[PDB]
């Protein structure tokens, strides 16, 4: 009967995968081939019995050959397909708990677990997870799909027992997107109860048992999961395979659990269950519950979304922390998101707010008094909108109920929201839809569900029936800015329509990222401290003390991530129109190589793409966020597959993931973390994408012709050499001080062209692969010495244009040193050639810089490089052409500098060196200079004229 | 030479005419042999073997296909042809700076590429890809020429 249970479980997994033949047909096929069924059982038994490993050579070939010969013998088509599918499931099984006999396991409670490789299963619909575990029982049935070794996701208590694998596979892509910025990749679990209790008619004892049955089945599902999962022991540091479990895969120990629509109060139960198996993660197994973070207190999600709101309003030109602004909100002062976010400014004027229970209408809200009443409501353990003081409500305002037949409309309520002038009463559904379409500065979301749709998306396709009567369209939203603290509030196509209608919006995975981020952060700290507890440095009682002491510092680190995330979003929004073509090739690469789905990711179709190209606009803000999320995942996949996380130059940033107390006290424990390679890769990709830009790495690969690994090498070297991160923080501080986003954004765009050019230079002129430490130690110090002295050798047109850019920057409040430091970026790029040249001729870099920039002055090279930059980048070949001409100019600059430094004496300055090189030229150089000045006189700057000017410069050199 | 001789042209004269654009390269060959005080035979061997590995004849023919409608485009096509020839001179200088005279053109090229950098392997790969595209406007030919130019330290 136990072998029959195994076959039945395989059939249930087959049903979840969507096998065509039904269960009746499947059992009939197994019945009509009893010899073949016996052969299948023999193959499985040979595969997974630990005693077989004690029985000599495993009877692999015997059982496998019996199965294959029985497969061949089949004539009937349905039988043949069914038995190959069965054989494929046997082959695909990676682990099983059929043979574990220790009493605490789930096998003892009649639960069977199959860890499978979905990648090799023929009948599985796409996408195929990296690993899957299927749990079968007569009471419970669950699945867990993981796209990677280090994965995170929520556990759905699903009610789709017919196909929950379908639900889990549907939600795994969105969960993975949520995890773009965090160390792990997407995972998702889900269980259904198959023996719910009989109902007593008593509305109370029934829900109690229904709850307790779900608790027992939740326990069963997780226990079956841990019967096959490996454990981590810090006694030796190695990964242990469950005893009496035969593993066909490698080693796989990381597994954490997050709450979902049915797993809200089960985190604590999950922590107890993880402890019963003796799992190493302890309380990090489940995010929060009883040891971890009180997310309502921290309010990390609200501040993470407030960073996006502030960035959007800054692009709007407003500052929330000092200027009154009007808000329409979803939720009440008793939830985490709404309550924590609506107290973040004392200038908040909450004009309207509906709930699940009540409606709040403040026609002319105050700021100080409205904030005080909002704070009073938040401090209560529980409250509703009926608890708002109705004396602090503005005249014409009030607290009304959503269960009323209708709600009267005050003249003050009507004018503020802006509807047809005749309304004097509305229905609660229409009041909610009008709140949803409001001429309001901010639209704050702290609820759950979808309330904004696209004009093209069907109502049933959204998957939210409860709000289906109140859902408005994205193009129909009149809010200036939309802040997304909640999940699934707006559909992707709805987000695209809102951005396309003039609204400011990001994706929800980028706004509410903070709460999940804190979940991951908490996990990686609970790991680290548990390791240090095992090493005897932290007494178990001070572990909790240390955790609570670091709450604020952990929150600040997550908010720093959100701010870097949002600043990059604003900058990407700035550069959308001119990079649409580059962005389009990126999308194609992802589709062709990473198995991306254009329509699923809400990425534009190619007809949609040049539709916008014909309109002269780039990607929308939610689409830009989506693209950068996939870029972050692809970059993590690229860097992790390499030895970059292994090398020390990339590993020098590891301690900075952890708070100050741990950074100081825990140093050896940080260096020997379990997730060291993954944390380093995630930090790496976050820094790279936030600093270098969306198209940096892809353009590097397009231009240079290397793999992502070489691009990363180059970015790290340039950031460490030029202090690029430090310049970025100085730019961001100026923008935070009140400098408009246009000035700081343009500062950053010049800086990113500089890094592009500099990274390309390092890749092009130094041997590959890059030794990042070597190039840093032979360039970064020299660069730091040469950057502050840009004023001593800029001459003529160079000096004039640099002064103009620095003064324009400082005219908007930018500090003078930073304005000048930014204005000279394209000359800091030439300092790389300056340093390389000084190294070749073993002479000082000061004099080399003097000659290089004086020569850049005599011929007016700045105008030529600017004209080159004006060359079109519409397609890849023209971009290649403009890149070829810029590099030709720079290389010719290198050869002419070599010849000029080959004449004269170091005491001769740039002007004297140039004078006596031209004094020692040939007819070729005088003719070239005369033609160059004539070219400058024409003012024509197409490919041909600039190219002939470059040849004139090239012929000035013997080595040509 | 065979097309010329098919119409009755004498064979020596047909071949002598058919090789005119390589007789032009013999000027650079002689100048180069003079600079390195080595015999012109071996210099010619290396120069034309190198013109063989990279398919330079197709690139010069494509350059000749550039328009001469106005003075500036004619100047541009002249610029690209001279850039190709000067880059030929610099690469020939570097290859003759490696190896030994007894090594023929193929052996000289083999051991210079055997002693290149990541820059040269990447440049060759991009050049072969350019040859594969078959696009021969100003921009593609120019980027092919920059690939050839970056193969030289003195650049």
Write the layout of secondary structure elements.
The structure is cut from a larger assembly and holds two copies of chain A.
Chain A: H1 2-17, H2 23-32, H3 34-48, H4 50-53, H5 60-73, H6 77-92, E1 93-96, E2 112-116, E3 131-136, E4 140-146, E5 151-152, E6 155-157, H7 164-178, E7 185-193, H8 203-228, E8 231-232, E9 239-240, H9 267-276, H10 295-298, H11 300-315, E10 325-330, H12 336-341, E11 348-354, E12 358-361, H13 368-379, E13 398-401, E14 407-408, H14 411-417, E15 425-426, H15 428-435, E16 442-445, E17 452-453, H16 459-462, E18 472-473, E19 481-484, H17 492-500, H18 508-511, H19 513-534, H20 540-549, H21 551-574, H22 580-593, H23 606-615, H24 621-640, H25 648-651, H26 660-665, H27 668-671, H28 676-692, H29 696-704, H30 708-722, H31 724-736, H32 741-765, H33 772-786, H34 797-810, H35 816-823, H36 825-840, H37 845-858, H38 861-869, H39 876-901, H40 910-918, H41 923-938, H42 943-954
Parallel strand pairs in A: 5-7, 6-7, 10-11, 10-16, 16-19, 17-18
Antiparallel strand pairs in A: 1-2, 2-3, 3-4, 4-7, 8-9, 11-12, 12-13, 14-15
Q: In short, what is this structure?
A:
Chain A: It is an enzyme of class 1 (oxidoreductase). The structure is cut from a larger assembly and holds two copies of chain A. Chain A is an alpha/beta fold.
